[PDB]
Amino acid sequence: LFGGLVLDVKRKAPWYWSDYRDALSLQCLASFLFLYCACMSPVITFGGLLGEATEGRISAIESLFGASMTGIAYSLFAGQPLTILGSTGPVLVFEKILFKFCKDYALSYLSLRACIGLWTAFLCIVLVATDASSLVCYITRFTEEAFASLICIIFIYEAIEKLIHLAETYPIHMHSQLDHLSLYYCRCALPENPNNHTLQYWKEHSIPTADVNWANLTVSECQEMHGEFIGSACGHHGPYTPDVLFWSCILFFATFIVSSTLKTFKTSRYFPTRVRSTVSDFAVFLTIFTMVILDFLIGVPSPKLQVPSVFKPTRDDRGWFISPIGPNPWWTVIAAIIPALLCTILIFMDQQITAVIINRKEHKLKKGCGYHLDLLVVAIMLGVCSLMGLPWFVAATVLSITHVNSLKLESECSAPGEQPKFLGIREQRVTGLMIFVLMGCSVFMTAVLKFIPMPVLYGVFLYMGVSSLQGIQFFDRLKLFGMPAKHQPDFIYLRHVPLRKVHLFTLVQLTCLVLLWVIKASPAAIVFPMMVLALVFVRKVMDLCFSKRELSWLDDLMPESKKKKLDDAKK
Amino acid sequence: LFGGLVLDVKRKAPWYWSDYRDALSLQCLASFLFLYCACMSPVITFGGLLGEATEGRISAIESLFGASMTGIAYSLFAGQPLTILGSTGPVLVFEKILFKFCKDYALSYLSLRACIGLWTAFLCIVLVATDASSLVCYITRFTEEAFASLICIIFIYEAIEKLIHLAETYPIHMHSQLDHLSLYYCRCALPENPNNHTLQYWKEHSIPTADVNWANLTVSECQEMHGEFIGSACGHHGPYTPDVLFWSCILFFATFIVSSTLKTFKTSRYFPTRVRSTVSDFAVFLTIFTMVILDFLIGVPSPKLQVPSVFKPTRDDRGWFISPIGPNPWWTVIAAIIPALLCTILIFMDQQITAVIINRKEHKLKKGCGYHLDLLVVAIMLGVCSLMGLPWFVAATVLSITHVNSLKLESECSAPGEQPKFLGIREQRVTGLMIFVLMGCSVFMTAVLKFIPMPVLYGVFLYMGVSSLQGIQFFDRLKLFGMPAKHQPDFIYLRHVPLRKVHLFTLVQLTCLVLLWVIKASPAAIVFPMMVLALVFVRKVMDLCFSKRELSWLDDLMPESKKKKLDDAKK
Ligand code: NA
């Protein structure tokens, strides 16, 4: 109820200091380096992708600042501070819709977006007052996993989409004809039967004496007269990249084989435990390090994550921090209630589901946890980031899970080679702080990531997407389609529910994935969070479609390993 | 004594028909398909490499003809049908020196080599008459593993090394730095301040008015015209290749990863076992299938394997069948006894050590073998090859072993995935025949391998090298010196033979390996076989340096498999 959220803080304050001294060097150092690089790339790409859309009033710097701020407060005042936030599809689409709505009565974007951001923030406060942890517990595995797994796959989907997309901006000579190598050339030249736009572009910009200069230009230079890249070395607007496409694929493919090699070192027998694990958690940093040397030696001009080195608010119509919201006539502010209310619901439900996925019996919880405090800290930080007109980041699934696995407490007497002991997972509360502090300080740090190529981070991302789901029981079953039925291990959840019913839960769950997939692909697509509601309604039905016993074997709330221990000790 | 190799044939007669009907498709098909390709490129690089050496007296086709016969007869008429007689170092150097010796008193090269070939054939005939078999016992695991490990290590190195050479002969740019890509050029041009060498080459070949040609000649034409390549894309003699390095590396890595993935699919569990196992054997065939297709589609010119379709003598002044030697001074033929005596010794020991390495009991077969038959068919094949003026071939290590490992019976009764029972190996002896049958018929066909570039054959080569060294006990151990003794792998040495004693033995084995290694690298390298002699002498000394019980564990002529059975049935 109202004033019952105090109990969360009271129940985490004795533990608060005790969770700093928990932290160690040689593990956290590595986790911080890993998450620092990981977290930086989506913020910048998102900031840019969003920059074009909301017409140059938002850019890399605005996303960097809001992201620094958010990370610093979240890692301090969260009742589950192990979620490492990252943007999602509803925000990106929502902003575009806000933008399309903001093409009439469009006197300031910023004042309208602060009014919308404030209404949804304050509403998130109204939700934590009433009924934020009075319904949350009604959920079960079907829906939480349908949501988690589907999202995780998109993580992989855009890792690949990122690579294939590059393939469009970097083409190749499709048959080299080396004998004709010395004949290859490409020069810029004037349009032949030129379009009006090229025509208008040339006239109104006033370029004098272009003929002495048109015989050969640099790559940027031709793009500014809009001329044809004519030659036998031109098959697309972008010249024929010799090697970027095919090196990029080598970087991409080598990372996903090598990164998996490094994380499985933990169970190797060739060393004692002390030099083993410590090679197996520097992994992402070593893969960044070696692909960096290979790229340095044999110089392919492969893309990198670039960050600007100039510090400013963009468009000269922003202060660093700007309070005023007067320009829109007053009524629009009142009219914003219906979108901000749809958003407070999508934001609320995203957050809470993600909290449910952290607060399972996987990634064991040692101490108590709070829903209301978690929601409180996103709601206050959403309100202030919106008050400074900066980008929003919401608790993402795969990021939280990989953050939680990198730092971890493990036994002092490990079995010879085989049988590593999980023995919990760490919560420090200081690397989350430092990551977003050091990424805040990287407005003027441009050298460190510029070298770090884009492809190696893309592999890191896809590997991340794959390894989060090794603990999600559903994917295991998804991969059981071509597998025979006598070939699996004991898997108690298989022995007392028929094969026909196992496949039948996988087909239906897969149907709702396919259903999500098409709603995501609609030119609206914001129904998706609210779809988790329907996945609960339908779920209840299924007790009658199939026996209640028949779901107490799969969705069963306690994890499969424990029930294997339990049922074997009964017999 | 004499006529004592007859027992081998008497012991190979009973099995004769049963070892064709033993033969089964898809485990033999795939092996043939991978080998056909593998063996042709091996006898093609050695025939063209001898061609430059013998001023075009011996050709690759002469090499194809000798190879087709050498293999065809051997797989019919030997005592081990899984040995493949490959293009080996000793031949080349012998032929060099011989060519160098036939510059004083060397009117004819072909007749002199044929006389030596008949003499060394003859020397193996008196050797094979008496005691070919008895002296085999003096060779043991020490020497054979030392010898073998080095050969496989070298083979792996020249897979990688050959690839480096391709990048060296098709030069690459350190940095493209794309903006100036379009600015780059290189055109052929007349030599300025011409060197005496190109001055001379130009003059005597009589090619007038090259100035009108040298505005811009093609890469092939300029590179044999000794003209200077002048431009910004020529830092060196030839323009930088856009795509050859990265495409060759993609074929190389890809082939090395997919064949080893596929070959371990036996111990994966995605399908019923019967349809599982068939896929793994053809994987080499599958890597070939898909890479030929991919290169067919988007082409990157890279060197491709061609064979002379035209069936002829070389230089059109030498008869096919040639003639019996007679023109040379009679005495030179008698003088050839000493070089040929040297040759016989090395040929007998090189042959015999490879045959010992195949006829291990960890390499056991459900059939016999005959050393004396193998030398005998080698001796016939050595005389006929020499009388017809063709290249000789001595037993190569990796080819014979990758044959053996590629086809092996393995049980399908096993538990799914892990533990596929070893159940001996497979010696049908019908694939060797079928390989060499198809390259014999594929001497006037060239269309088959013109569409397979070298790099993919090189990735096959790297897979051959890595997978081959399975059976070598020593290399396993070298890789266990890092492993501690807390959870050390089960090697017999820990309780029966002290770590100190295993180490002293491995260090002395390694020193004699490094000594065989420097000997190989020596500008003679005739001395490589006689060293094997020394490896015995040194073996004897240790009979006073150590108890004999403590060395019967790793140099046993009964495998570990038997010791594991014995020592487990005692306790
Ligand atoms: Na999300």
PDB file of N, CA and C and ligand atoms in Angstrom, chain A residues 88 151 350 395-396, ligand 1:
ATOM      1  N   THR A  88      15.227  -0.405 -26.009  1.00  0.00           N
ATOM      2  CA  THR A  88      14.249  -1.332 -26.488  1.00  0.00           C
ATOM      3  C   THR A  88      13.430  -0.663 -27.570  1.00  0.00           C
ATOM      4  N   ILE A 151      12.856 -11.682 -26.823  1.00  0.00           N
ATOM      5  CA  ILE A 151      13.663 -10.473 -26.781  1.00  0.00           C
ATOM      6  C   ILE A 151      15.132 -10.804 -26.997  1.00  0.00           C
ATOM      7  N   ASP A 350       7.429  -3.655 -18.450  1.00  0.00           N
ATOM      8  CA  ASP A 350       8.761  -4.087 -18.912  1.00  0.00           C
ATOM      9  C   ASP A 350       9.693  -4.315 -17.794  1.00  0.00           C
ATOM     10  N   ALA A 395      15.422  -1.497 -18.318  1.00  0.00           N
ATOM     11  CA  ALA A 395      16.142  -2.781 -17.852  1.00  0.00           C
ATOM     12  C   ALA A 395      16.027  -3.818 -18.933  1.00  0.00           C
ATOM     13  N   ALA A 396      17.225  -4.214 -19.549  1.00  0.00           N
ATOM     14  CA  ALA A 396      17.208  -5.225 -20.604  1.00  0.00           C
ATOM     15  C   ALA A 396      17.603  -6.538 -20.012  1.00  0.00           C
TER      16      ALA A 396
HETATM   17 NA    NA C   1      13.198  -4.337 -22.594  1.00  0.00          NA
END
